[PDB]
Amino acid sequence: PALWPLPLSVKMTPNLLHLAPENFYISHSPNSTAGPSCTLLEEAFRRYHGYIFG
């Protein structure tokens, strides 16, 4: 896999899924007590999309 630290429960399948840089979106669920006003999350959201791809 590659996880560090190792989570408390990791259940993996052999089935693959593919992602698209100029087409992948990290956004809030419509039923979540934090939305597009959340500085903290909005920041991470942008930062990580960088780490994941880059």
Binding site: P14, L16, T33, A34, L41
Partner: protein
């Protein structure tokens, strides 16, 4: 065959605009599925650890295709205080390098930066109330952490769910304090 979106869902009251404390719930549950993968956590902090976990699951295959195995993760920390102790007294650490340490803590799911900021050798902390402390105790006047430097660290560590716990060691390890505070230090006779 595609992951089109990762949706982040905060369950309880976000704590979105706060500073994390010793009892901040960092638990999350992750779902990697098509077409839309989902990350859920009670508080904002969990989502931080979860987005970190999620970055460690995507990879490029033999052909540079971006790929993630579909999976179901459920994760909470065993311990709630997981810190690094840095000493910026015995040598001055350029503010940039403290930031990189945080990023590296963020990748490593550490949540406390024990900042042993002062000691016998130097007093780098620029006090607002006692400005002579740095002025006379610091290694030199460039080797100083101005308020805004220290502000920047705390706001930089917040955006990665790290708490900054400062340490001002007393009554030992204080030889530098009495460079700018007369009579504060017991004088050695004999």
């Amino acid at each position: 065959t595609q992951v089109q979106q990762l949706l982040v869902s905060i369950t309880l009251q976000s704590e979105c605009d706060a500073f994390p404390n010793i009892s901040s719930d960092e638990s999350y549950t992750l779902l990697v599925k098509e077409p839309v993968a989902v990350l859920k956590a009670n508080r904002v902090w969990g989502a931080l650890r979860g987005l970190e976990t999620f970055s460690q699951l995507v990879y490029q295959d033999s052909y540079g295709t971006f790929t993630i195995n579909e999976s179901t993760i459920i994760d909470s920390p065993r311990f709630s205080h997981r810190g690094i102790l840095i000493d910026t007294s015995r040598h001055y650490l350029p503010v940039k390098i403290i930031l990189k340490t945080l990023d590296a803590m963020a990748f490593n799911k550490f949540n406390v930066l024990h900042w042993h900021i002062v000691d016998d050798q130097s007093f780098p902390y620029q006090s607002i109330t006692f400005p002579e402390l740095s002025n006379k105790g610091s290694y030199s006047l460039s080797h100083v952490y101005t308020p805004n430097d220290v502000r920047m660290v705390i706001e930089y560590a917040r955006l990665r769910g790290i708490r900054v716990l400062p340490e001002f060691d007393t009554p030992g390890h204080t030889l530098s304090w009495g460079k700018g505070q007369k009579d504060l230090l017991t004088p050695c006779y004999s």
